[PDB]
Amino acid sequence: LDDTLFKDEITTFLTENGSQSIKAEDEKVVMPYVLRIFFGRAQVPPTSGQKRSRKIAVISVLPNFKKPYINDFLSLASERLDYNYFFGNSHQINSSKATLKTIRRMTGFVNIVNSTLSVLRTNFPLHTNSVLQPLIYSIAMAYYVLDTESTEEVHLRKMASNLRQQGLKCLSSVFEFVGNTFDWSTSMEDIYAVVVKPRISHFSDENLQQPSSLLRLFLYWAHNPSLYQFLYYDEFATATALMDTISNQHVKEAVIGPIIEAADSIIRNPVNDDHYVDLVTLICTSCLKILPSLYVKLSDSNSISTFLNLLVSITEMGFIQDDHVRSRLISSLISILKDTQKILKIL
């Protein structure tokens, strides 16, 4: 609790295998007190260099703790967040809960989760009740406030927007670190319906400039076979939205390159289900349609190579059997001419 001795005490008292460290028997009783104390320090506003370091110190002792205790700390952050009503009902937000105060509480929670993810990374313990379902609820209200709120409450609108940006970033992080390890089938429908579904309609015009957290999210699913069922929902709505970004006239190279890499993985990652066949047919035709206009935009040799790598992927899988696929694969190829061995092999 003492401010001057706080930093030295953490390194001494809480270091794993420390001589002064808590004995294994005494952890169960002492630990809740430790978590509450460290939780108290975590709300210190970072308005100075010392204060920023203190917020880094409190998050940095998390790896020392055992995983059950880490989950306890994440729980304490989310206890204030009232979310059980949201998931209890059919995912409808209460008007009373929608206030600047509640937005302020969630912004703190996501920041702690973002900080914890950076420290633990793959070792981060992911649980439905403690972190994921409060996290999804936060992105839900950010959507709820922004559409419902009037332009007059600029401060609330700005505050909600920050929660959306952090929440989407917080998702894209947790998918990356622990996506493969954790099994998401139970919460899978909830994540799409609450996060991806509302923004699918305008996903195309939104992400032209550079990759965004929601876009980085879609790419990860495209890369990982297990999470393709995300791409299957709503007649492959997310799959189309990615190509709608590509189909736009003004999409920049930073956004182009990743998606073709993602699309190439899907072609090179066979999956045993009907939805996969309709997807790849959708993926190939859309990426094949707009390809020549993308090449002129491309200004990097590597960006050219990945474009070729997708073409050779098409030929190997046998889509070139189709007359429309073949004739247009040539059209994109001649645009490349208008790596060399890869081209010659394709010809």
Partner: protein, 170 residues
């Protein structure tokens, strides 16, 4: 009592100079600060001008930088293992610049698994001796800060030729 003036010393030719003047404040000296491992005790010093100096009477914690990966972590200082100037400082565990000390492996290790997901593979490859140190649980580090001046015990981890030479000396 401590003074630095070149006057009291003999001349290059061996002649001895006479006392030109009394001792001056602007050529003063102060007692050494033998920093040792122990509960953080630092006291400020009013120096020339409005500036101020920190005297590290005791420190446990220091900021050590893993250069090869470009990170820096705060870590407890275990003890002084070797110092190149005077070995009594090693015997007394006195902390000064260029002293060779032992630090805990914990924050560096946890960062290692977190970033590399390994207890990609090519990047995770690390020099064998340091991996042996990780397995040991303590790392050899060299203090680059001056605890007698700044009140810090910052340092950097030993690697490569530096590490090999200091192990050979050990």
């Amino acid at each position: 009592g401590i003074s630095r003036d070149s006057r009291h010393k003999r001349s290059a030719t061996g002649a001895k100079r006479a006392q030109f003047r009394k001792k001056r404040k602007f050529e003063l000296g102060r007692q050494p600060a033998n920093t040792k491992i122990g509960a953080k005790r630092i006291h400020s010093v009013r120096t020339r001008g409005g500036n101020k100096k920190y005297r590290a009477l005791r420190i446990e914690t220091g900021n050590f930088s893993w250069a090869s990966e470009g990170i820096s972590k705060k870590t407890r200082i275990a003890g002084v293992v070797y110092h190149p100037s005077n070995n009594e400082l090693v015997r007394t565990n006195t902390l000064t610049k260029a002293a060779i000390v032992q630090i805990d492996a914990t924050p560096f290790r946890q960062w290692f698994e977190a970033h590399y997901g390994q207890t990609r593979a090519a990047s995770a490859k690390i020099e064998s001796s340091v991996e042996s140190q990780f397995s040991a649980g303590r790392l050899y580090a060299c203090i680059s800060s001056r605890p007698g001046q700044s009140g810090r015990c910052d340092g950097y981890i030993l690697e490569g030729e530096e590490l090999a030479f200091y192990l050979r000396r050990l």
